[PDB]
Structures are given as structure tokens and as C-alpha cells.
Ligand binder design. Structure first.
Ligand code: HEM
Length: 405
């Protein structure tokens, strides 16, 4: 299902890549996207898939475009166009300087200070979940840890009942990895209908939870509106429910296949932070974009106003020009270059929370379950979209090789 090639786009720049169903997905989602970095592919190409849009394939261009919000606006940051136009989350649908004050408020509820304060609960939950699974000798990692660990921490931060997780997780996933069951707008609206009642309650009887803080915050020297709080909380729900949740599975899948890397972190724990960064590079998973504010010649390519351009955060770190032997995991890389958490004015505010959750998981999991692997004959499948993920990850291990703390 390709859209007619626009007049201004040269045929030699055409490369029909589908970000929601890459042809080489069976080899791994990152590998599937890396086909865009083969020698036969230009640095900047146009795909006729998903309505038609540009795709920057090199880290240099991706970074450049994310810095130049003047030409590349966040007003319509998602592909397809229908999703990008319906998307109105704050601050991700705003350009500087309008995003400034909202970004500051969001930083108040998920910033480093909050993460350091919540570290004890994060550690507590990781240890509890892992210790419960340890003597079982098996688990379905996605539903047994990848999901409950980051999600319960977020629901605690936001003061939301855990009973609502199933409902919320379904909706956030419809936005990032569309099922065709409902439009982007419908999923977004459902999320808003859930928040509206809560925000109204929190504005009346304020609490100390993340939603209360956002709902009663100040922006531009004045009170934040019910609508703006809703648009901010919508983004927080996606960050809490569909980011780290997916990344942990890519990382655990790799570790299950690499005894050498597991042993490495076990005897050299101080390398965990660096391992976290290298895994964030190798298993990068986000891909959003921008919209051209006007006609513009970018690196010899003529872009037209209204054109959408995908700037895959995932691709920068896999670019061989940024990291030699990009598909190889090396915890000792002199410089782990990547844009996994974004680049520019919208650099992820939850990156500190994400790193803390990843580092705690690596340390606590390897301590109790140092030796494990993917279930026999199990064929792991990945899924692609705005945020990519792992369908299922069955792991197995000899309980006799585990350690209780
Ligand atoms: C491994 C996990 C994560 C990854 C890879 C990630 C990635 C990103 C990226 C690439 C952006 C920028 C998008 C753009 O430029 O349009 C972003 C923005 C953002 N992220 Fe995350 N994120 C993660 C986890 C989280 C978590 C756990 C939270 C909080 C609950 C969070 C909150 C935010 C917020 C609030 C923004 C908007 C910043 C702004 O617009 O100024 N993220 N994230």
C-alpha cells in the first residue's frame, strides 16, 4: 500500500521502508531498521509507505534535524500524518520557546531528585519480583517482570490504582504500535477520558502524587489549565507504560544469549552503568519525527512545506560512522554514541528514571539468576512502531544455579 510519489521527490531517493512492519523484522527489529544503512541507500530517502515521508538514515542528519526546530517542527511529530495531527501531548507537540515552561514542570515530577528519592522503592520492587521468580526456573519475562516492574513504579509515582494497568497498557500500545482496531485519536481520547475525572479531583483535593503536582502547577507565571495538565499526563502515561517496559526485554533477550556478558557484570559491577549505556545504544527503540515548516534544501535534498520526516532516534547509534561494528555489544566502548533518549530541546525527561530502573534490574537480576537462557526452540519475535518491542520472552534456568539474598 504505497502512496503516489510526489512531484518534488526524485525517484533515486525512493526506498519503501515500512516503520510499522519492516521487511527484515525476523532478523531483529534493530537489524530490520539497519537495512536503511546499507551502501545502496542514500543518507536521506523517501518512503511511499504510511502516506509517504522522508527518513533520515544517518546520525549526523538525525541530530541536525532535531536541533533545528525552526525547520523541523514537533507540531506533527508522528507518522502517519493522522497520528501526528491528532497528537497533542505536552511538551512533545510544542516547539521552543513555548515548550520551556511545560518541560520544567514535567521535570518536577520525574526528574533526578524524584528518582533518587524513589530509588529505595525501585530496588525493593525489583528484589521482590525477582526473588519470587527465582525458585521457579522459568518465566515469561515480558509479563512477569518487564511490565510489572516499571509500570508499578510509575503507578506509585502517579498515585494511580494498579487495577487500571490493563486498561491503560492497551491504550498506550494502540498509539505506539497500532493494531488497526482504533485510530490514534480514539486511543488518545480514551486516555484523556480516564485522566479528566482524576485531574478534576486532584485540582480540588491536591495530593503529593505526580498528577496532583502537574494539575496544580504553574506555567508562564499562571495556573496550568485542566486541558494542559491532561495533555502532559497523557505523555507521562506513555513514558511510564511503554518505554522501559520494552527496552528491558531487548536487553534481557541479549543477556540470555550471552553468558560472557553476564559473567562480566557479575564480577565487575562497576561496569553496569556503562553496560546500561551500551545496551541503550544497541537496542535503541524509539522513532518519531518532525514536520517541515516550509520549503527547505537539506543536504542537497529539496524538502517541501508540510512534508513529514522520520528521524529515527534508534538509528544514530547503529550508524557505523558513529560506532565501529555497530551491531556488536561491547561494554568497554571508548565512547557509546547514541540518541536513544532523543536529541535537542525534547531530550527525554524520564531518562534518569529509565537508567535507574535498567541498572537496578541488571544488578538485582544477575545477582539472583546469573545463569539463564531462552527457552528451547523458542522463536523470539519483535514488533516495530513509534516504540518497538518484544512479543514474548520465555526464559529458563536451573533453580539450583540461583542465589537468594
Ligand atoms: C528507555 C526508555 C525511554 C526512552 C528510550 C525514551 C525516549 C524519549 C525520546 C526519544 C524523547 C523525545 C521525543 C521527541 O523529540 O519528540 C522523549 C521525551 C520525553 N520522555 Fe521519554 N523515554 C523513555 C522513558 C521515559 C519515562 C520512563 C518517562 C517518564 C515517566 C519519560 C518521559 C518523557 C517526557 C516527559 C518527554 C518529553 C520531553 C519534552 O518534550 O521536553 N520517558 N523520550
Amino acid at each position: 500500500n504505497l502512496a503516489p510519489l510526489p512531484p518534488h521527490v526524485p525517484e533515486h531517493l525512493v526506498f519503501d521502508f515500512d516503520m510499522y512492519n519492516p521487511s527484515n523484522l525476523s532478523a531483529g527489529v534493530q537489524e530490520a531498521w539497519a537495512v536503511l544503512q546499507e551502501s545502496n541507500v542514500p543518507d536521506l530517502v523517501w518512503t511511499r509507505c504510511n502516506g509517504g515521508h522522508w527518513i533520515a538514515t544517518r546520525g549526523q542528519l538525525i541530530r541536525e534535524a532535531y536541533e533545528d526546530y525552526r525547520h523541523f517542527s514537533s507540531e506533527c511529530p508522528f507518522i502517519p500524518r493522522e497520528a501526528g495531527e491528532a497528537y497533542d501531548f505536552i511538551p512533545t507537540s510544542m516547539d521552543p520557546p513555548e515548550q520551556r515552561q511545560f518541560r520544567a514542570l514535567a521535570n518536577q515530577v520525574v526528574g533526578m531528585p524524584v528518582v533518587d528519592k524513589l530509588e529505595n522503592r525501585i530496588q525493593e520492587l525489583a528484589c521482590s519480583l525477582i526473588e519470587s521468580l527465582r525458585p521457579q526456573g522459568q518465566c515469561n519475562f515480558t509479563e512477569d517482570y518487564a511490565e510489572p516492574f516499571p509500570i508499578r513504579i510509575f503507578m506509585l509515582l502517579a498515585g494511580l490504582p494498579e487495577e487500571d494497568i490493563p486498561h491503560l497498557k492497551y491504550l498506550t500500545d494502540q498509539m505506539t504500535r497500532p493494531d488497526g482496531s482504533m485510530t490514534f485519536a480514539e486511543a488518545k481520547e480514551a486516555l484523556y477520558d480516564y485522566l479528566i475525572p482524576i485531574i478534576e479531583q486532584r485540582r480540588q483535593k491536591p495530593g503529593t502524587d505526580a498528577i496532583s503536582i502537574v494539575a496544580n502547577g504553574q506555567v508562564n507565571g499562571r495556573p496550568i489549565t485542566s486541558d494542559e495538565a491532561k495533555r502532559m499526563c497523557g505523555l507521562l502515561l506513555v513514558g511510564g507504560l511503554d518505554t522501559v517496559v520494552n527496552f528491558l526485554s531487548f536487553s534481557m533477550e541479549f543477556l540470555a544469549k550471552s553468558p560472557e556478558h553476564r559473567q562480566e557484570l557479575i564480577e565487575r559491577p562497576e561496569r553496569i552503568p556503562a553496560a546500561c549505556e551500551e545496551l541503550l545504544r544497541r537496542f535503541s527503540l524509539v522513532a518519531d519525527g518532525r514536520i517541515l515548516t516550509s520549503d527547505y534544501e537539506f543536504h542537497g535534498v529539496q524538502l517541501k512545506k508540510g512534508d513529514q520526516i522520520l528521524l529515527p532516534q534508534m538509528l544514530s547509534g547503529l550508524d557505523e560512522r558513529e560506532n565501529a561494528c555497530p551491531m556488536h555489544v561491547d561494554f568497554s566502548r571508548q565512547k557509546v554514541s547514541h540518541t536513544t533518549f532523543g536529541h535537542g530541546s525534547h531530550l527525554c525527561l524520564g531518562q534518569h528514571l529509565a537508567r535507574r530502573e535498567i541498572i537496578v534490574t541488571l544488578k538485582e537480576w544477575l545477582t539472583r539468576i546469573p545463569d539463564f537462557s531462552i527457552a528451547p526452540g523458542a522463536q523470539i519475535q519483535h514488533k516495530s512502531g513509534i516504540v518497538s518491542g518484544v512479543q514474548a520472552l520465555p526464559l529458563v534456568w536451573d533453580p539450583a544455579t540461583t542465589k537468594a539474598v
